[PDB]
Amino acid sequence: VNSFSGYLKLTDNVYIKNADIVEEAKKVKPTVVVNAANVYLKHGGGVAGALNKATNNAMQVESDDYIATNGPLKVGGSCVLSGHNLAKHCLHVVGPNVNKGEDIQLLKSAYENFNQHEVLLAPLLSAGIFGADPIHSLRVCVDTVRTNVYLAVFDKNLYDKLVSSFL
Numbered sequence: 001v002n003s004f005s006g007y008l009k010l011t012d013n014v015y016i017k018n019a020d021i022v023e024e025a026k027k028v029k030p031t032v033v034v035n036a037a038n039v040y041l042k043h044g045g046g047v048a049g050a051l052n053k054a055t056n057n058a059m060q061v062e063s064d065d066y067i068a069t070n071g072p073l074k075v076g077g078s079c080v081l082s083g084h085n086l087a088k089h090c091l092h093v094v095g096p097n098v099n100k101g102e103d104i105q106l107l108k109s110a111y112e113n114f115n116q117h118e119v120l121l122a123p124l125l126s127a128g129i130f131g132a133d134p135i136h137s138l139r140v141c142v143d144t145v146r147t148n149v150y151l152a153v154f155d156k157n158l159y160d161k162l163v164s165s166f167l
């Protein structure tokens with residue numbers, strides 16, 4: 001039993017809710033919140049910009065130190081950093097950004113990072129400003145992630161769609 005509330009169950013291990021991940025996160029304090037990061041951990045907009053804003057820019061300060069030490073992530077890769085006031089940990093995962101021409105096959109590799117964590121609150125990778133089809137993204141998520149994932153979808157219209165077209 002865990003503290004996540006109001007989700008619809010898609011599979012044994014995938015759940016989904018119309019929610020703001022920032023507000024979903026501040027209430028649950030999940031062990032892991034996933035950020036839809038870029039390779040530079042520059043959290044300017046989308047989920048990343050919102051999450052970072054909710055940390056009063058502490059996420060960005062920590063991220064800049066990480067990059068200064070380690071260099072950029074790989075597309076499809078991830079790193080674990082602090083969750084600040086939102087979660088114990090933040091798993092920064094780089095999905096491919098279609099608006100940069102990145103290969104969509106890397107979306108499966110991106111979701112594989114979720115399997116290193118027993119339970120996660122997460123957005124749909126490569127959705128939103130990253131330009132992928134959130135329905136394809138949901139399919140890859142369901143077919144790749146084996147751990148327990150709670151998907152927060154900000155847009156009510158999108159959500160209702162994803163549900164109605166799910167197989």
Ligand SMILES: O=C(O)[C@@H](O)[C@@H]1CCCN(c2ncnc3[nH]c4cc(F)ccc4c23)C1
Binds near residue numbers: 022045123126
């Ligand atoms: O649409 C984008 O560009 C992306 O970021 C994707 C797709 C939809 C939005 N996004 C989220 N997914 C789940 N919760 C969210 N809360 C937010 C608050 C914001 F100010 C901006 C985006 C989100 C957000 C992931």
